[model samples]
Target: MNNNELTSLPLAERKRLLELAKAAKLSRQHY
Candidate 1:
């Protein structure tokens, strides 16, 4: 989703997404 769509989500959902994104970045670095 785009920034606007993500901003429309609840705070909890946004936090979850951020965590997921962080994990993805770490995984990419490892690989």
Candidate 2:
């Protein structure tokens, strides 16, 4: 959501964040 949320996350949470960011990018492009 925010930069702090991204930065303070653990490895697994960061990984999921990357996945979520990537999926959001893809879906935005798809639309």
Candidate 3:
């Protein structure tokens, strides 16, 4: 799991975002 994408957010928010992303079956993709 690449965490560089979450470096800018506060720790709690980053963790929350990560949880949501994981729960939602998300994967990184290019636009």
Candidate 4:
């Protein structure tokens, strides 16, 4: 999703997405 679509999401969802994104980045680093 674009930045505009991301901004449209609820606060909780945004945070959840942010956490998921961080996890994905960490996973990549671990490999």
Candidate number achieving the greatest lDDT relative to the actual structure: 1
Q: What lDDT does the true structure give each of the candidates?
A: 0.72, 0.69, 0.70, 0.71
Cα lDDT tens digits for candidate 1, 1-31: 4567756769868788778878785656344
lDDT of 2: 0.69
Q: Give the TM-score of candidate 3.
A: 0.39
Better of 1 and 4 by lDDT: 1
For model 3, the stretches where C-alpha displacement exceeds 4 angstroms are 1-9, 26-31
lDDT of 2 at 3: 61
- For all predicted structures, in order, the TM-scores are 0.41, 0.41, 0.39, 0.41
Model 2 TM-score on a 0 to 1 scale = 0.41
Q: What is the C-alpha local distance difference test score of candidate 3?
A: 0.70
> Candidate 3, clashing residue pairs?
none
Better of 1 and 3 by lDDT: 1
24 in model 2: Cα distance from truth in Å?
0.5
- Give candidate 4's error at residue 27 in angstroms: 8.4
Q: Give a tens-digit lDDT track for model 4, residues 2-30.
A: 56775676986878877887878565634
| Model 4: lowest-lDDT 10 consecutive positions | 22-31
RMSD of each: 7.9, 8.4, 10.7, 7.8
